[PDB]
Amino acid sequence: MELSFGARAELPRIHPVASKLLRLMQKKETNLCLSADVSLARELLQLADALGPSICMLKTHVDILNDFTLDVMKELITLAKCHEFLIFEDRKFADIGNTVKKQYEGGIFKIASWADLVNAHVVPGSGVVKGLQEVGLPLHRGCLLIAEMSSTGSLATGDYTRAAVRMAEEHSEFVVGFISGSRVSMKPEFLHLTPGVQLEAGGDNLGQQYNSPQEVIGKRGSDIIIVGRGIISAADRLEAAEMYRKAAWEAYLSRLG
Amino acid sequence: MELSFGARAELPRIHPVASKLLRLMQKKETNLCLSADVSLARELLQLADALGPSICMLKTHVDILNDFTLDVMKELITLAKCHEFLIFEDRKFADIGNTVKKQYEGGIFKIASWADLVNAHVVPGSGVVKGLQEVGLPLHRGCLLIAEMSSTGSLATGDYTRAAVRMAEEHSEFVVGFISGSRVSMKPEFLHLTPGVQLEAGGDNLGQQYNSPQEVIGKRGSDIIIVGRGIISAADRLEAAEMYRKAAWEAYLSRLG
Ligand SMILES: *c1cc(=O)[nH]c(=O)n1[C@@H]1O[C@H](COP(=O)(O)O)[C@@H](O)[C@H]1O
Ligand SMILES: *c1cc(=O)[nH]c(=O)n1[C@@H]1O[C@H](COP(=O)(O)O)[C@@H](O)[C@H]1O
């Protein structure tokens, strides 16, 4: 039984961060996350401002920003509130719990202070989630677990993916969904976000593989497309964003009815 | 037909970085890597200077340093050159090749500019290594692949571990060995480095598990122990470093002869 984003936002077990997201997806008619894979703060903020209306989420790699400061992140928060989107830092945590706790809270980035969402690899075992949760819980943050990857030779398959699902189910106070290539849980309170998305067929020269929004959202039952180069490489990033938005939104609408 | 570290340093297929490491290990009689898990530059630099003579390597998490600057790294390299140890950034890369390339070279940290060694998880497939190599090779760097993890519930087992070994063999120009709990490769040009080490049985509250140096080096056939809290939390960190060095060194001597 397929529910709209708006209905899912009111599910009994839903995390407030997942609720917030689903509500804005419904309101704005977007299930598109911009992967803002740029090196300049000015470009990041210019993309966030311009594309903000078209997106439900902006995904960051702050460790690639040459001119990162916390003040940059303050302005990004301002744009996120204005345009109504979540910020997701794609840190892809993959260490022991005691370490990831500090990497999340601390250092120069202070990721927990500005990121609504983060993600973690499950390879280290559930300790990884426990450590993140000690930081994220009071801050009303959420976490996505990496159940599958988009890249060639990914080992995130079979029993590995199944472990990802179990680990999410067991930490549903904090874990709000998955990075995956398709639906991996049947629990509707879980979000499925899918990278490796482009309109055109292809890949890159470093193992990345692309599937279309229609395939990912429509056929494979994912919720949100994550799109970097498909948009960022365009001349007009706004036009490209709208193209991806409409593709993902209509694929979603068709699955519902 | 087990060779000494000194002999392994001279193997025809040895990587230059491994060779440099192996030689200093023999020279200093140390197969101990300090995990310098601290939040202040001053403390990182003080531990490096004080414990430098006892260690073959210093493992960093730069993303937990509250006051990182490239100047702090410049100074660490000075100490590394003085005391003769390598710098290993435990970045645990776990993303697509295109992304890790930028995370390794770029951002605020510019890891490749100062870390002799980095490590990577094998979960994304070989693209993760291809991406890092692009930066690492011109900069005369090495990489370790994470074949096993020390934490409870680790998924880095069986076929995954085998996959890591194959990936290293196929990228021997850049990959110099492993993060593992035991010997995973029969090829003597590869290093094995083992975290999750303390003299006493136990663990932490967040899934870390400990085995002793004699167990790891002696019975399980690893080359180097990685030790954080076992040293840093001791009252006397110098004496602590010396105990771990002597344990790991003796264990190595015994396995050899
Ligand atoms: C993370 C996990 C994964 O399985 N695949 C990924 O590509 N990523 C990240 O998503 C973005 C993909 O961007 P693009 O191929 O659309 O440009 C990227 O930031 C990568 O790190
Ligand atoms: C990395 C990989 C692994 O399998 N286990 C690990 O513990 N780590 C890193 O090694 C250090 C262990 O420190 P300690 O338990 O001796 O204090 C730590 O920096 C962890 O991130």
- CB A200: neighbour CB atoms within 10 A? 7
Residues 114-133, chain B: which have Cβ within 8 Å of A? 121-128, 130-131
Give the ligand whose atoms come closest to the C-alpha of residue A98.
2
Residue among A153, A215, A142 nearest A179 (CA): A142
Q: At what angle do helices A41-51 and A70-83 cross, to 10 degrees?
A: 10
In this structure, the number of other CB atoms found within 10 A of the CB of residue A209 comes to 19
Residue carrying structure tokens 């629990």: A187
**Under 8 Å CB-to-CB from B229, ≥6 apart: which residues?**
B35, B37, B198, B204
**B204 part of the active site:** no
**Ligand lying closest to the C-alpha of residue A121:** 1
Q: What DSSP string runs through B19-62?
A: HHHHHHHHHHT--EEEE---S-HHHHHHHHHHHGGG-SEEEE-G
- What resolution in Å is listed for this PDB structure? 1.5
Strands (E), B79-208: 86-93, 117-121, 142-146, 175-179, 191-194, 202-203
CA–CA gap between residue B183 and residue B48 (Å, rounded)? 28
β-pair partners for B144 = B119, B177
3-class SS letters over A191-226: EEEECCECCCCEECCCCEEEECHHHHHHHCCCCEEE
Task: Identify the CATH number of the domain in which residue B125 sits.
Answer: 3.20.20.70
Which residues of B does the annotation place in the binding site? 35, 37, 59-61, 92, 95, 99, 150, 208-210, 228-229
B103 and A92 in contact (C-beta within 8 Å)? no
Residue B238 structure tokens: 């110098």
Quick check: B95 and B130 in contact, CB under 8 A?
no
Residue A60 CB less than 6 A away from ligand 1: no
* Segments forming the whole domain that contains residue B146: 1-257
Q: How far apart are CA A89 and CA A97, in angstroms?
A: 18
3-state secondary structure of A176: strand
**Residue A73 in 3-state DSSP?**
helix
Per DSSP (E only), the strands in chain B are 32-35, 57-60, 86-93, 117-121, 142-146, 175-179, 191-194, 202-203, 209-210, 224-227
A88, containing H or E segment: strand A86-93
Q: Is the dihedral of CA A139, A168, A33, B122 positive or negative?
A: positive
Looking at the complex, does the CB of residue B151 fall below 8 Å from at least one CB of chain A? yes
Q: Which of B64, B90, B154, B178 to mutate to test the pocket of ligand 2 (most atoms within 8 A of CB)?
A: B90
Total domain count, chain A: 1
| Method used to solve the structure | X-ray
Query: Which amino acid makes up residue B165?
Result: V
Task: Confirm if B151 and A125 have CB atoms less than 8 A apart.
Answer: yes
Closest CA to B244 of B220, B219, B216, B221: B216
Question: What is the interface size between A and B, counted as CB pairs within 8 Å?
Answer: 174
Q: Is A133 in the pocket of ligand 1 (CB under 6 A)?
A: no
How far apart are the C-alpha atoms of B74 and B91, rounded to whole Å?
18
Q: Do B154 and A95 touch (CB under 8 A)?
A: no
Polymer length of chain B: 257
Question: CA quadruple B171, B176, B180, B183: dihedral positive or negative?
Answer: positive
Pairwise CB contact (< 8 Å): B152 & A125: yes
- β-partners of residue B142 are B117
User: What are the tokens at A35?
Assistant: 């992967």
Among the partner-chain residues B37, B67, B121, the one whose CB lies closest to the CB of A121 is B121
Gap between the Cα atoms of A193 and A182, Å rounded: 8
Rounded CA separation A44/A62 (Å): 10
Contact B222, B180 (CB under 8 A): yes
